[PDB]
């Protein structure tokens, strides 16, 4: 392409329906300058190893020909074409006996280059749902070959599987190339012991059209198993060591087929290597493997004689009684009898989503969590309206204020606590939330790489939660030291979203940035105070603050008016971050006590940010000051309690308030910015307007 | 070897929790009827489901019901193959593993059960058929080996 340009678009038709260059003698069938210039053209076009090249030197002009018009023919057409085979039709050149016997190299070699031009124009097709099912079909057909009966045809498709595998990591954890996989090694496993001397060595697979030709030999059926049964170990660990819920819960589903079950007392190691891999913490697999069984037999006996009404009312009931094995088994029959339908019936979908939140308990949480992977895991084409319900159950729970959202009580003062009313801790209770988020986090990982509709979703929820009111008693956020777990966690998942490449745009990462550091200096806007939790789940808050710290600080990305503005809050963030994690790492074990210690990495980092900004001088220091009270005057007023050692921060915020006193009211230390003019010096009685301020202790 | 480990643990609980569904609403007689329905049409899926049931009904009652224990164990009597025998050997295994007190009367009806197969020449007890010589069989009836069979 390169005369009438309608031509070129002719040959492409032409070539989009064009049959194969196929033969029976072959060679027999078919100026020293022009052999040398095609030669030429031909290594420079196909760019071989120096043996193919030697081997190509020795042609005719009828062979080069030949092997040009297979390289256009098949490029056009893969180029050009639309049928689901694609790249499958060049294997049809390998199973033609009269090229297999001339004096190969030259067909892989060309074929090489057409199965790259086919993955780099695949690579950037679009993120829709049928491609993946176009990929799964081509790594299934990869996988079948892979044992061929020839010798250079298993290793070219070993590399081509190592290649389309290492180019597409999310088809690892698919949920029908595991399938495939370990069905073919039954059927080898079942060919390996058949009495040698019987006749037919064909063999079929179940539910993929396919059929496998073995050797005669014993030696040879032995190798052959032996070296099939590595890749799958080597990809299974591999999976795992990713994304082990997902594989999990896939071979769990697996496990249950009742074809299986029959030829159980057989050999049948397909069933042998599942469990083998998934033992090489097995209670709650065990457990979730049984009851799913079990709840499917009570609800298919059941069916046996429309009937949600039952189940929704045992439901209800249960929930009204306040029963927990009730709800647990009402919740499993709904589920079991949801996944074995032939329509959606949304109704019973809403029940199952909204069901906990009548029930805001750790055991509900843990039962609908784990009907709700069943469930994924069960059903196909049913995630987005699942995750729109989800959405909706979350976005309701904001509203009400249940739990992380909830309100603010204020405490006792034990300076003027001897009235009837002691004082004592009343921190809140956020268990739900912290396993939400872990739930949420997963499947965000999975729907990053898998689609590109449930982005949309987690953009919408995330934006709607947050807000930008840092202030005094405003914030859509409970501000207690007892729940900064989820609250940096979420905040964490924010920014693992904003780094990952995938909002297209570039108004709406401005917004959420914005969000994001609005409430990460929210939090910041009141008296320090020491955590209450238990031993136990305090090393897990300063693991994620020292996670959300490093990923805070690898963020580097009119513009010099933003830049600025964004640097500059970034720094102050780091530093009162690294300041917090400090104090909350000092409270936790008093002696040093090197056996007990932490992650090491981050810990060199934090501590070397703290030399540094502990390094600085008092100017550049005294305008901080200033963009705090930019910000907001509160978190100015509370600065001096995270202590700095330098006056400097006193003279300016006392500065700052005798300025204007009347925008800080907040009774307890801001008075004490103010109250004094001069300590001793006993002057300049102006400006002292105390009538509107609060009420301090006595 | 662990295969059959998962099938028979997969296998109780699921037929366990069919019949608890199925009990929610006598009711042997469908059972039997199945199980004979089973056996006249020589139906290998639905015998393994009815004998799974049948077991699974008995485990969990509060009397011994001869009559079922009399249909188990004469069972696979009318189905000699090896299927069968596979299928009885592990629902006698789960129910004497389940039910307390309940050895001897399986076991003399087990007995029971074996001397009727001895005494109508089943199997290893089958009469003998002589085969045919080499020297003098050039007819139609030509030598062919014909062994018995005697899997179960």
Same mark, same amino acid.
């Given at each position: 392409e390169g005369w009438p340009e309608e031509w070129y678009e002719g040959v492409c038709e032409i070539a989009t329906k064009s049959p194969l260059l196929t033969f029976e003698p072959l060679r027999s069938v078919l100026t020293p300058a022009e052999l040398s210039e095609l030669r030429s053209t031909i290594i420079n076009l196909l760019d071989p190893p120096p043996e193919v090249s030697a081997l190509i &030197? @020795? #042609?005719?002009?009828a062979m080069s020909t030949y092997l040009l018009s297979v390289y256009r023919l098949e490029y056009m057409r893969v180029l050009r074409s639309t049928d689901p085979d694609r790249f499958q039709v060049m294997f049809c050149y390998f199973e033609d006996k009269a090229i297999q016997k001339d004096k190969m190299q030259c067909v892989i070699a060309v074929a090489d280059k057409v199965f790259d031009a086919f993955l780099n124009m695949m690579a950037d097709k679009a993120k829709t749902k049928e491609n993946e099912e176009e990929l799964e079909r081509h790594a299934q057909f990869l996988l079948v070959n892979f044992n061929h009966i020839h010798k250079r045809i298993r290793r070219v498709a070993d590399k081509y599987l190592s290649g389309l595998v290492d180019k597409f990591?999310? #088809? #690892?954890?698919?949920?029908?190339v595991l399938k495939t996989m370990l069905d073919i090694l039954q059927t080898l496993s079942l060919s390996l012991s058949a009495d040698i001397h019987k006749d037919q060595p064909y063999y079929d697979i179940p539910d993929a059209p396919y059929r496998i030709t073995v050797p005669d030999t014993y030696e040879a059926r032995e190798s052959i198993v032996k070296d099939f049964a590595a890749r799958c170990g080597m990809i299974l660990q591999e999976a795992m060591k990713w994304a082990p819920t997902v594989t999990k819960s896939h071979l769990q589903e697996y496990l &249950? @087929?009742?074809?299986?079950w029959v030829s159980g007392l057989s050999q049948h190691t397909g069933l042998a290597m599942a469990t083998e891999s998934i033992l090489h913490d097995y209670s709650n697999f065990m457990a979730s493997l049984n009851l799913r069984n079990r709840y499917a037999g009570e609800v298919y006996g059941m069916i046996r004689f429309d009937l949600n009404k039952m189940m929704v009312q045992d439901l209800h009931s249960a929930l009204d009684r306040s029963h927990p094995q009730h709800y647990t088994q009402a919740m499993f029959k709904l589920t079991a009898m949801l996944i074995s339908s032939k329509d959606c019936d949304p109704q019973l979908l809403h029940h199952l989503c909204w069901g906990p939140l009548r029930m805001f308990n750790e055991h509900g949480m843990e039962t609908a969590l784990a009907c709700w992977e069943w469930l994924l895991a069960g059903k196909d084409g049913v995630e987005v309206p699942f995750m729109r319900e989800m959405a909706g159950a979350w976005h309701m729970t904001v509203e009400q204020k249940f739990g992380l959202f909830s309100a603010e009580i204020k405490e006792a003062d034990p300076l003027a606590a001897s009235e009837a009313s002691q004082p004592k801790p009343c921190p809140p209770e956020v268990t739900p939330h912290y396993i939400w988020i872990d739930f949420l986090v997963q499947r965000f990982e999975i729907a990053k790489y898998c689609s590109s509709d449930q982005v949309e979703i987690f953009s919408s929820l995330l934006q709607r939660s947050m807000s930008l009111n840092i202030g005094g008693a405003k914030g859509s956020m409970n501000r207690h030291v007892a729940a900064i777990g989820p609250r940096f966690k979420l905040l964490t998942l924010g920014l693992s979203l904003l780094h !990952?490449?995938?909002?297209? &745009? !570039?108004t709406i990462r401005n917004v959420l940035r914005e969000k994001i550091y609005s409430t990460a200096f929210d939090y910041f806007s009141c008296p320090p105070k020491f955590p209450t939790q238990g031993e136990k789940r305090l090393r897990e808050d300063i693991s994620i603050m020292i996670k959300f710290w490093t990923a805070m600080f690898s963020d580097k990305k009119r513009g010099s008016q933003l830049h600025k503005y964004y640097m500059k809050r970034r720094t102050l963030l780091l530093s009162l971050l690294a300041t917090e994690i400090e104090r909350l790492i000092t409270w936790y074990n008093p002696l040093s006590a090197p056996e007990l210690e932490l992650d090491q990495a981050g810990e060199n980092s934090v501590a070397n940010w703290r030399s540094k900004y502990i390094s600085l001088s008092e100017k550049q220091w005294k305008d901080n000051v200033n963009l705090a009270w930019s910000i907001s005057p509160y978190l100015a007023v509370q600065l001096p309690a995270r202590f700095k050692n330098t006056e400097a921060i006193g003279n300016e915020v006392t500065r700052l308030v005798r300025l204007d006193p009347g925008a800080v009211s907040d009774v307890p230390e801001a008075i004490k910015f103010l109250v004094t003019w001069h300590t001793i010096d006993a002057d300049a009685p102006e400006l002292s307007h105390v009538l509107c301020w609060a009420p301090t202790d006595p």
């Open positions: &030197n @020795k #042609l005719d002009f990591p999310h #088809l #690892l954890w698919s949920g029908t &249950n @087929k009742h074809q299986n !990952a490449d995938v909002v297209p &745009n !570039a």
